[PDB]
């Protein structure tokens, strides 16, 4: 369905870590808790990766998904399947060079001196949990990974009149019986169905008459008038293609919740001789 | 979702402090009494330290022209004291769009999404006699209210 | 032949789902309907799959059609064959982070939690009839797939100044005997030599309360005593989207002709004189 | 097809909420009574708020010159009032020009295909006495008129 | 040789289809025939394919050519072989979505409905005649197929501000004893063309003298009553001059005619009474 | 072939449609009655509506210099009545230079071989009296004729 | 940039059809050999290059364009020939 | 020869089986009967096999050489329903609902097997009316291919039968008349014309000339016995020549008409 309010722009993205397994703030909780400092929320164990850049964002990306349609010598065509298994990842760019921010680069530091922090040659295991949230005004969608393993997507770069960076790729991977991955934000997975209404807005009784728009075509002029059927009517056959029985407007009060299939407005209000019919607003 | 603002709804809370559009003297602690408008009042109401914002360019978002605007705002800070104290006060005020920014800063008109400079903090000539001009232009970027 | 009216200029797509063999509206039903609110349509289960980005079309594609030019050493051209055969698709930008554009790209939400959507490892079956239509003009050219597999053709996009994408890559696959996808226009495709009349006989004057059904809709009932307006009346509040002003009804003495946007017929009969005031024929 | 039409005969009844081309003020609820023309009337005529849309540049396509064309529309707004109902009033044609893109509004003269920004609303010196200008570059596809 | 006549810049290409092996019109005709309506032709059997751009043309191309230059041990750069034979094709770009012109494209309609083309999932054969007739001002350079094999070039083509496209690749192939494909111009090929003549024009013979430019050097001055074999011998004064052999003079107009292999033209003069004058035309 | 033309031998006669070089009135159905030209006349013998055609440059192709050329005209159109006359009149003078390059007409001093807008129909300012003006640049394409 | 007959039998070999006003093309390949001279002229120096043996083949498809000359792109591929060489500068100065 | 028109590629194609000696459907009606569904044919008696592989076609081999050969054809099935199992593993050796049960040892399984080549509806026919049935090898599985089950299907005599007939109207058996070419010379008002025949022109024939005339101007260099190996007969306006070497249009030079000659291949 056509919603608005579910487009989004990422503004700025926090990246927070924790050792596997570690849970995410609830659904709610991610309203509310104050993304600056991950020691203080209700859910303990999380903490900030670092100084990502101002300008870019956590970059997802898969390999794998190389995909084929294929067939049989009677009928081609029969089924698509996958030929490479899909492998989600996140590239995170972090900017800063203290040994936290180090240590999701190489892994552990293998030296114990005071002001070195120093690597081992070969392959390494650096598995933590993986928790983004990507914020837009009011809108908090955030991601968690239950486990990933950390990987140097490529060398430290370094540049003269550009912030050095130490990329890590995040891969998912399955832990235990939990997802993969989980989008979280309260009002738009799982939530109620919320169905449209619109607010026929007529301040009680007055002088004059008004026009409402039916998907975009006027039905005739209406004064102030009784409601059920005497409205319902009026709203329904507009040449619309639309039975009244889909339509329905209800004992709303000073004030009318009209709903059904197609979108409603008012055209023009001349209802003058008094408060008026000044609003159709959802 | 509610409708994009004139850019003037958006920056004059932020740089002023307050919601208040009314009020133009700002209460932000690194600018305290600096007046913040559209416009220059006439010579027998002017007040020094001044800052001043005009639109300049900026469209409306190609793929969602309703969701999203990308203003190009002129922001010009003038001040009678000296051109060190309106280069500072220029910064000061860039400082809070930054940090306006980084917090997501919501206006009653709407949401401060991102701030950008595309000239920055350049001295220049000023029309008001003994007084030094710097100015920049900023392309902000401004979301909707919520309703 | 040049035709300045077929010539096309893609201005908007809207794109729509349904289960798999859900049929579209029909090629005169797409010149009536609103694109904005599918739940008002006659053919129901279509519903829009979301924002897509407005400066953008629907994207589609092939691969495979690599095809070549063979022969023997007698004549060395005579078959172009095709070395394999076209798979064919079409790549669309959600620009919604709603549950009901997620579907679309990860498949089904994997958990039960308000406020949260599951991904579960390895391939997922996802697959929906699927209606597109392209706007442009005063034309409506629409393209239905009965059955597509819908799989993610790049992961999610997200910048700091454009808006954030989701793309599915929609592969038309056949099923059951029905054609891969379907063009649907009725001033271009099949087209009938230009106008249409259905004769309205009234030989049988002494009559009765008999009724047409238009579009498949009943026009209430029309008394033995007709008149050529007031039957254009009657059949022009036919409540299936078209108004009177569409219809162009002319008479013989013995007949009527009737014409206009929309298929004609007879439904309750009710008549003294046998068939000679109830019949309709082209 | 019939044949392309002048800008104005398109972008008018777009603004104006009717194609009586007699009749210059507006009727759309956003900028009712405003007077929207092509040609700014003499001191004893003229009435503000004004728009003023004027042509400014834009060819035909060169795919198909007689099926197509991109003309390019300065479009102005003025006030007597102040400089943010000026802004609001040219923010609130914006609004209007979208939609109409958005539905291929049908005009007697022709079909408004699209509308894009070439440079966005921006404030301006005014050459008439006490009001202020807010102007920007529109550019909007047009399609014949069937028949 | 060189020739200025027969240099060209096309500036409009018409693309017709006809049914497999008919015949082009003649190469006479293509001086006469209107472009716009090959349904009025002599040749009676093409139809026009459609609107395709003002801006662009049908593309020539092909696949294979590769060549590599072989020998033997003994001598090593002997005989040049093609490695892969050229198949040779055109490319249409088709800009309008009739019926007509999606048969082009797709094939057969595969519905019968009104308001619908469909399309079946497997290959399809799908033949014509080509013709291309190529146009610069008064040069309309013909291009004949007897049997072309039209298939898909690429995907449908939709975009916000650009036109909509249906690009058509056709594949030249032999049909019986004919050519593979001809071009077309009855000025051009098999022509018997003459000699380049170079006309003398003078005044009414009142004043001295003359001079001519043979090549790039100038014989000696001349007067208005010289013989044709005086003149003949005054050109003959060149690097491979022969008088009487290698230049020839007729005098079939009253002023004369030079023809041989070096370009003439006038000098500095003095034959007043009007004007010497050269041209290379008769 | 003969020599390649000055783009006014070749340009005025599509607009005027007839090859009579010395009578400067259009005959064509959609300009009847205007005068095309390349030197606006004195104040005393100027008579409006008028098309105004010069060359602004464009070169010899470079491939063949002797054998087409591409000539880039300022068209300007002018009118004593009104500005939508003159949009119409610009309109209606660029549709005969699209028709007359669709069909390669030859005129006696060379051929049409292709027309291409590189800045479209404008309004400027007009340097004479009531008068509008309405202007452009048109990159032509000329063949010598077949001489 | 030439589209006479005697411009296309470098291109297409010989003319297959004997029809005043056509020329034919048959399928496959051709034996399309020539002598061939080049005369490059700069200041007033003529450096010369002669082969007399090339075989010619089409190097690209013909191009055609609005507003750019239409080509028939052939190359000459150096062959030997008996006892002689691939190839020759002449220029009696150098 | 030359037929250019019986080139196979074997883009779609079909396997049924049915209970031994079961008769194929008629070449003339194999061109027309619907291939999906074989329990609506008027040959009745067939059931369609499984999905067969898209990439491994059948292989019609043969073992012997010089002792004396017996032929096969290798066909992959696809799918794994009963319909396919029967095939690779012999009849199902469990009564119990929803279980396909394998005994040891050799089993006895013997079907008539009939295909159907398709391309573009040629459909060439293959039919046998006895083959034995076993494993060629292993059952193949892969995660991003169709499992598979390739059968060896080995031809037997019976009851005087050919061992397979290959099935197709247009091909076998035909009545191989010649080639004739058709001189419509359209409107034909006046002027002249020639014809050029094995790619040598006949150099001038009237408009108004007789099928003698035209049998004489046919008979140019290098050809076969001047007027006795080129066939030439009138019907309606027009001409139907043929003889050993192929004839069409040269050069038309006539005053009026669409054209000179239509000609068959």
């Given amino acids: 369905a056509l919603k608005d309010d579910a487009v989004l722009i990422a503004a700025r993205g926090y990246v927070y870590t924790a050792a596997v397994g570690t849970a995410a703030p609830t659904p709610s909780q991610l309203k509310l808790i104050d993304l600056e400092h991950p020691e203080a929320w209700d859910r303990t164990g999380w903490d900030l990766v670092g100084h990502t850049s101002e300008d870019d964002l956590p970059e997802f990306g898969f390999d794998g998904g190389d995909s084929e349609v294929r067939g049989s010598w009677q009928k081609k065509k029969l089924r698509e399947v996958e030929t490479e298994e899909i492998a989600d990842y996140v590239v995170i760019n972090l900017t800063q060079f203290d040994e936290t921010a180090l240590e999701l680069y190489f892994g552990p530091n293998q030296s114990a001196t005071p002001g070195i922090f120093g690597v081992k040659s070969g392959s390494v295991v650096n598995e933590r949990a993986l928790l983004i949230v990507i914020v837009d005004n009011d809108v908090r969608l955030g991601f968690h990974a239950r486990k990933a393993s950390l990987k140097r997507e490529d060398a430290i770069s370094l540049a003269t009149d550009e912030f050095g960076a130490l990329p890590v790729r995040a891969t998912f991977l399955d832990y235990q019986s939990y997802n993969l991955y989980e989008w979280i934000e309260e009002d738009w997975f799982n939530a109620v169905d919320a169905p449209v209404v619109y607010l026929l807005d007529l301040g009680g009784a007055t002088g004059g008459d008004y026009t409402l728009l039916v998907g975009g075509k006027s039905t005739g002029d209406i004064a102030y008038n009784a409601n059920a059927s005497a409205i319902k009517t009026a709203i329904g056959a507009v040449d619309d293609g639309v039975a009244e029985s889909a339509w329905t407007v209800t004992a709303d009060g000073s004030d009318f919740e009209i709903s059904g299939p197609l979108a409603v407005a008012l055209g023009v209000d001349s209802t003058t001789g008094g408060s008026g019919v000044t609003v159709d607003v959802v | ?147």
């Fill in chain 2, 1 to 147: 979702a509610g409708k994009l603002p004139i850019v003037g709804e958006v920056v004059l809370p932020i740089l002023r402090g307050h919601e208040d559009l009314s009020n133009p003297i700002s209460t932000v602690p690194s600018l305290a009494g600096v007046h913040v408008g559209t416009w220059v009042e006439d010579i027998d109401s002017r007040t020094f330290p001044l800052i001043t914002v005009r639109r300049v360019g900026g469209t409306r978002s190609p793929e969602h022209p309703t969701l999203f605007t990308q203003p190009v705002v002129e922001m010009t800070a003038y001040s009678a004291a000296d051109l060190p104290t309106t280069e500072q006060m220029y910064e000061d005020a860039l400082e809070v769009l930054y940090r306006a920014a980084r917090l997501q800063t919501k206006t009653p008109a709407g949401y401060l999404h991102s701030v950008t400079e595309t000239l920055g903090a350049s001295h220049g000539p000023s029309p008001f006699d003994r007084t030094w001009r710097v100015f920049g232009l900023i392309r902000l970027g401004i979301r909707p209210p919520k309703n």
